[PDB]
Amino acid sequence: MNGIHDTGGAHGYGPVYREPNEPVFRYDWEKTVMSLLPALLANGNFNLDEFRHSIERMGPAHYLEGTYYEHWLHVFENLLVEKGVLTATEVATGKAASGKTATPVLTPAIVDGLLSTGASAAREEGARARFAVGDKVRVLNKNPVGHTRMPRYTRGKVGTVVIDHGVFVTPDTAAHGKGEHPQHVYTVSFTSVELWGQDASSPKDTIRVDLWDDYLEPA
């Protein structure tokens, strides 16, 4: 999706302001919002790819104006409705339709073990690797309206495979109920000049991006 979230290369966002001695949570409500994510993921109410793409689809101004955890809050209020877990009325009213009709998967006894384990997106088998480290590859010019992890700034550009990380779930399909279609992910190295042109570049600098096998073609 060519949305406001795909920020790489954009101008106009200004200085990187940073707060001295920033706390982990700046407001109490952020604690609630943050802790909801693992709780709802544990239920299997949505997956992480769906979560990302729900944020991508929030209004552009809303995305820019909202602080980080407001993005998450948006997903909970909207993706849970799209998935049929909550109704729009429930969300608006804050009142459930009919009592405790579910049981929390994330309980106190399993919090530590679950957070310490996580859930790898690595998979045993998937499409064979077409590329080897040292290969020159070009990122395909694709412009899907749905979820993708090829940033706009890389499309059509030529780089060098520098790592083959192995097989992973494909987000493009996993975010849209089309299965995992596991395939290789490579780190691809681009020169500054290749990405940004002669004027806006520095001779030494490189940008590495992690890209899926079928995002690429031989250069």
Binding site: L64, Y68, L73, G99
Partner: protein, 201 residues
């Protein structure tokens, strides 16, 4: 001249009430357990943070065999010190050298290695850092007080997949025979993102 889109702008006035309403709903439907949610908050407020990565770095500085293990398998390497899990399942450690300075970003969102660095600060997740780090890293680092020699390569790593990166910064001079704990004290969060250097003694 207020903050607008840098991550530090004021939230809406009614946000706390909105958050409470949703929370009451999810608890009433039986979707979430408040007691478990408190444990998650306690975990990221008090147990998981950059002191973890700092131990990883200090150990690599003093133990060449560990360093090599860590560079070969980041996940297994950080697990030797008891760090692991959510948002750090597949770790890759980026060694800074006299020739190469590494730094990472998530241009598409906020991906960051929670098990060693904790939750990211607001600036890491906002448009200014995310937009500019891949096109003008030197200009961004300068705003942090960090000037990389012209002849040193900067490698910016965009975290677009499910690999998570942490930088292994270069050990400062003047730290001969420092214990791991004393070395760890020099290792800042910024030095493990690549947006700063470890404290010089």
């Amino acid at each position: 001249h207020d903050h607008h889109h840098d991550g530090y702008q004021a939230p809406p006035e009614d946000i706390a009430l909105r958050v409470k309403a949703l929370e009451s709903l999810l608890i009433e439907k039986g979707l979430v357990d408040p007691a478990a949610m408190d444990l998650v908050v306690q975990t990221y407020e008090h147990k998981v943070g950059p002191r973890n990565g700092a131990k990883v770095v200090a150990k690599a500085w003093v133990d060449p065999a560990y360093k090599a293990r860590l560079l070969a398998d980041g996940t297994a390497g950080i697990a030797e010190l008891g760090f692991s899990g959510v948002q750090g399942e597949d770790m890759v450690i980026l060694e800074n050298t006299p020739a190469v300075h590494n730094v990472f970003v998530c241009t598409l969102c906020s991906c960051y290695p929670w098990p060693t660095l904790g939750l990211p600060p607001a600036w890491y997740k906002a448009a200014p850092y995310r937009s500019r780090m891949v096109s003008d890293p030197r200009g961004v680092l300068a705003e942090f007080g960090l000037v990389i020699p012209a002849n040193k390569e900067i490698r910016v790593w965009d975290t677009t997949a499910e690999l998570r990166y942490m930088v292994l910064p270069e050990r400062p001079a003047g730290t001969e025979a420092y214990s791991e704990e004393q070395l760890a004290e020099l290792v800042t969060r910024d030095s493990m993102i690549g947006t700063g250097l470890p404290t010089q003694p």
